[PDB]
């Protein structure tokens, strides 16, 4: 029992919970996901098509499905950009840090 | 208050905790890290140089420092490969799943 492993665990159980036996995510899957787990961002965002454009930047294949790999990337782009915040605007919490900065 | 955000939070506080004002990680930083947080893997691994070789595959620049970006990737390679396990050997827990499959 650790932290990272406790985290990686969630991260791993946060994909299929929004996918299923199908094992992937469609445009409507991402949308509902980012609004069924971490709405503290997309909500106070600056566009109602954010999910649409994000979905596009995700499935570089444009078929509809989104695998765990490309998926994780999404869980990264946010964390990465979020991390950079510590390097400046600093030095449960992410719930706000996310809805705060956004980049096209 | 959510799950992913609660996770991303840890993920974010699990880097600098092993870095500091320096804001990065050296070969000795990774080693101690993977043994100060998730030892359930590198330990029952198949090589004592795993960290050395992994470190190499991480800082594609070979200077010594490892930024959060390249760092996260590490937190990915494990999770990704781990995920693939569900697709077969299935269908706190990671503590074991990690030490189980490797390159």
């Amino acid at each position: 029992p650790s932290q990272m492993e406790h985290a990686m665990e969630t991260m791993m159980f946060t994909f299929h919970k929004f996918a299923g036996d199908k094992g992937y995510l469609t445009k409507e899957d991402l949308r509902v996901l980012m609004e069924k787990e971490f709405p503290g961002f997309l909500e106070n965002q600056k566009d109602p098509l954010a999910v649409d454009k994000i979905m596009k930047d995700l499935d570089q294949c444009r078929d509809g499905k989104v695998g765990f790999q490309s998926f994780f990337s999404l869980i990264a782009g946010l964390t990465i950009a979020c991390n950079d915040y510590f390097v400046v605007h600093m030095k449960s919490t992410v719930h706000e840090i996310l809805s705060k900065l956004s980049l096209e | 208050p959510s799950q992913m955000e609660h996770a991303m939070e840890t993920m974010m506080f699990t880097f600098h905790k092993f870095a500091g004002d320096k804001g990065y990680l050296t070969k000795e930083d990774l080693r101690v890290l993977m043994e100060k947080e998730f030892p359930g893997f590198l330990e029952n691994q198949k090589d004592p140089l795993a960290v050395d070789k992994i470190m190499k595959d991480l800082d594609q620049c070979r200077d010594g420092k490892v930024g959060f970006q390249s760092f996260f990737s590490l937190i990915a390679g494990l999770t990704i490969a781990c995920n693939d396990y569900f697709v077969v050997h299935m269908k706190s827990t990671v503590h074991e799943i990690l030490s189980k499959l490797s390159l």
Binding site: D57, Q60, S70, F72, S73, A76, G77, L78, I80, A81, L103 | I54, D57, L58, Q60, Q69, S70, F72, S73, L74, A76, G77, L78, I80, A81, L101, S102, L103
Partner: peptide
């Protein structure tokens, strides 16, 4: 596993 560079961030 194979920790390879990811693709795209934000």
């Amino acid at each position: 596993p194979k920790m390879k560079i990811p693709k795209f961030t934000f």
